[PDB]
Design a binder for this molecule. Sequence first.
Ligand code: MET
Ligand code: CL
Ligand code: CL
Ligand code: CL
Ligand code: CL
Length: 247
Amino acid sequence: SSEDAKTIKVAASATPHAEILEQAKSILKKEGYQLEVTVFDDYVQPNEVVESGEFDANYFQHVPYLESFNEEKGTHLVDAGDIHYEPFGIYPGTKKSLDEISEGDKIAVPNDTTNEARALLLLQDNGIITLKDGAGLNATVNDIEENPYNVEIVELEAAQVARVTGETAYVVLNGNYALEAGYSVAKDALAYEKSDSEAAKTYVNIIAVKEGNEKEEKIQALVKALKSDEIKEYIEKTYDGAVIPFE
Ligand code: MET
Ligand SMILES: [Cl-]
Ligand SMILES: [Cl-]
Ligand SMILES: [Cl-]
Ligand SMILES: [Cl-]
């Protein structure tokens, strides 16, 4: 395990996660660690490859997603560090403005528990639907009380939502997939979560590890690098408010 002690294998999303990790590689190298990043296109395999012990950690999900994944998939993963937040947004599909919303419009949303709930909460915040009191972080389409435009919620894998912009009136995208598809939340989103919102302190992206590894020296070194002034400044200067360092 001496070679293992110096290497940090991290499963991550393409953007911003792998780009942020690439900047942190020089920080960790100076500290005697070899950061090795593998990029994943989905939200399932990064947790499975940490649970199996193939990777030391992953950098792709928020706290509600991890909790729901531990319950729904039987993983035992832990949040080793809170790093950044990505404003969730409603982006144009076949309609370019929310003022154009009309009866029966399809809205594409992520189909996992917490990101679907997040999409329904963002639609509620924009007066499109209302949800039952107490629906919360695991709100489903069955929690919809009011639906004045009789919108059709089209549930797809989060990675696929940006690819149905010619099939649905609007699409609700995770920051990482909006960036991957070339969107800018600040310029292109029709509506998005505010940086002083409840979502801003709830959907924080983390470093997740197997239970019992959250205090490993190398994990603590990785988390400290990602929360450093060099990484926070890189995030602020690069992503134009689409990625916000956690504080
Ligand atoms: C896999 S949970 C979603 C993570 C995504 N980067 C977000 O902050 O919306
Ligand atoms: Cl609009
Ligand atoms: Cl439609
Ligand atoms: Cl529906
Ligand atoms: Cl996905």
